[PDB]
Amino acid sequence: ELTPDQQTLLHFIMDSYNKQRMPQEITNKILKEEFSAEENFLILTEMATNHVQVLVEFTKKLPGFQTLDHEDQIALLKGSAVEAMFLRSAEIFNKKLPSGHSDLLEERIRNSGISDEYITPMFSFYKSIGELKMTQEEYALLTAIVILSPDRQYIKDREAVEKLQEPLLDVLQKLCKIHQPENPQHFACLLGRLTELRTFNHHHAEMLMSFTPLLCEIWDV
Ligand SMILES: CC(C)OC(=O)C1=CN(C(=O)c2ccc(F)c(F)c2)CC(C)(C)c2c1[nH]c1ccccc21
């Protein structure tokens, strides 16, 4: 069902998606026998910095992204960093772990210097989106779609972003039909999550209200 053009777009995206730290690289670090809230916060700051570094690089390689106006490119990166981080956290969180460990993961993140006001919403999101049983390809495409969002603040040429976003949505809709052929609702389910992710922008802003040179550059703190 993917056209040849679509197959190659997907392939370039998965090549670049596959350069991130594996879920266990992240999750082994938090779950190790020796734990403190203090080192775990520093640990999370490091992981957030690497996530942004890897996202920056993902935008260099994302087909068409570097044909955009340079200022718009930076604005898309800054407008999408936090949403991208939470989506990847959902993907990571839903990967199988040894006995007791997903419970342990959640409890440590809950005792890392950040209040329950933020943490509870975020784990409900991870578990809910987890029940959709998205493939790696769906996560990758939905990430690209988040980044190429024409309605971000400060974009000068919104039509230019739209022209790259629409082909990605077309690919995603095919992937949903390929991967869950008996679930006609799937694509609409993922459209929903596009909007739900945006709620995290406010929480994170709040959370920070209560860092590394890259995070200072991209989060603007
Ligand atoms: C691994 C990448 C994709 O994600 C992270 O970096 C974040 C992960 N976050 C997760 O919840 C997360 C982290 C690790 C996991 F293994 C997981 F399943 C979920 C969220 C948050 C807000 C706790 C956090 C994130 N980083 C923070 C930095 C400072 C302060 C807070 C954070």
UniProtKB/Swiss-Prot annotation:
A biological-process GO annotation: regulation of bile acid biosynthetic process
Location relative to the cell: Nucleus
Superkingdom field: Eukaryota
Tissue: Liver and hepatocyte-related cells express mainly FXRalpha1-type isoforms with isoform 3 and isoform 4 in approximately equal proportions. In intestine and kidney mainly FXRalpha2-type isoforms are expressed with isoform 1 and isoform 2 in approximately equal proportions. Expressed in pancreatic beta cells and macrophages.
Per UniProt, location of the Glycyl lysine isopeptide (Lys-Gly) (interchain with G-Cter in SUMO1) cross-link in this chain: K32
Single GO MF annotation: zinc ion binding
Protein name: Bile acid receptor
